Design a protein around this ligand. Structure first.
Ligand SMILES: [Ca+2]
Ligand SMILES: [Ca+2]
Length: 350
């Protein structure tokens, strides 16, 4: 009866969504022309999980009961910790680092991989002055958690043209590499064998630059970010992704949402079914935006809306689960897809 069984069969199941306790240290392997993430034994793995929103704004999700719910009730094997730099983030309020550290420890404690995301966004060039602390930040995390097999580093969320920015061309890609290579080098010199994920121009829509001009490191993957109200299967972003995957580039969806790219609108679930069917079929890991109760469709939790609803609390109790009615439409859908169960939405009639 579930509609996905006939139409989108790779949406059902989770046998490859292995936790650290089972998978151990990750690697990239070559399999039938593709470079894909695999576990310690060389068996394909898929990471599926959730991103925080900016930790300067929504740190409340960094609590053990929420992390346990995500790992156990939602079936996540990854969580992404989005540390803005600008916009009230680390450049002006460095105490957000403390929340990233806490989050790494809670991911480990709850048997998940963890992505540490230096969340470049405004402005768009990772080399900009505001981001000068990036190399020392990664240094510090690696000193605290040396060669830790749970951690994946994401050096620059979304290179993009916001001034001062990067261009959507080969010159823009060169600025990204010039940024990333010295950090990678430092991490490797320090003995860190972690997977490192590298963004690309146009808001991490251009993993295809790695076809002819990859970074020379066998544990680097390339991000692609999409939002299903904006970006459609067989559209620009999708085809750049597909072109990279086909050509053997290792690709990881570190951020996607069910809204427009603004974080709002919809959600657009029928389009999400098409993207996730492709990602699951092609062994591409994915992380959904975001673990917030802000009033925007991409947030996973019900928001405060005057006259309508109190916010769902991100600081969860000892039951280690949110009721489905406490999840937004997006969060309920994403939970279903992480777990690999049929999507069977609740009625929402106020
Ligand atoms: Ca807390
Ligand atoms: Ca984004």
């Amino acid at each position: 009866t579930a509609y996905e069984k006939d139409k989108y069969p790779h949406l059902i199941g989770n046998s490859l969504v292995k936790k650290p306790s089972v998978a151990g240290r990750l690697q990239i392997i070559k399999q039938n022309g593709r470079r894909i993430l695999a576990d310690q034994n060389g068996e394909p793995i898929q990471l599926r999980g959730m991103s925080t929103h900016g930790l300067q704004w929504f740190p409340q999700i960094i609590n053990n009961n929420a992390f346990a719910a995500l790992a156990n009730d939602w079936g996540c094997n990854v969580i992404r910790l989005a540390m803005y730099i600008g916009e009230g983030g680390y450049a002006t309020n460095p105490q957000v680092k403390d929340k990233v550290i806490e989050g790494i420890k809670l991911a480990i404690q709850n048997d998940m991989y963890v992505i540490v995301d230096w969340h470049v966004l405004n402005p768009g060039d990772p080399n900009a002055e505001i981001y000068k602390g990036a190399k020392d930040f990664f240094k510090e995390i690696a000193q605290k958690f040396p060669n830790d097999f749970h951690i994946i580093y994401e050096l620059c969320n979304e290179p993009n043209p916001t001034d001062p920015g990067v261009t959507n061309d080969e010159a823009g890609w060169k600025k990204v590499k010039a940024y990333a290579e010295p950090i990678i080098k430092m991490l490797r010199q320090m003995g860190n064998e972690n997977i490192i994920i590298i963004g690309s121009p146009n808001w991490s829509q251009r993993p295809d630059f790695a076809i002819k001009d990859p970074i020379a490191d066998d544990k680097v993957m390339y991000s692609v970010h999409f939002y299903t109200g904006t970006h459609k299967v067989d559209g620009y972003v999708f085809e750049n992704m597909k072109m990279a995957i086909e050509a053997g580039v290792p690709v990881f969806v570190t951020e996607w949402g069910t809204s427009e790219a603004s974080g709002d609108g919809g959600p657009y679930l029928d389009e999400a079914d098409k993207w996730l069917e492709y990602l699951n079929a092609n062994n591409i890991s994915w992380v959904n935006w975001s673990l917030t109760n802000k009033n925007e469709t991409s947030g996973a939790f019900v928001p405060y809306i005057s006259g309508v609803s109190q916010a769902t609390d991100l600081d969860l109790g000892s039951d280690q689960k949110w009721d489905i009615s406490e999840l937004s439409i997006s969060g309920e859908y994403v939970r279903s897809r992480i777990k690999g169960i049929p999507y069977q939405p609740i009625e929402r009639t106020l």
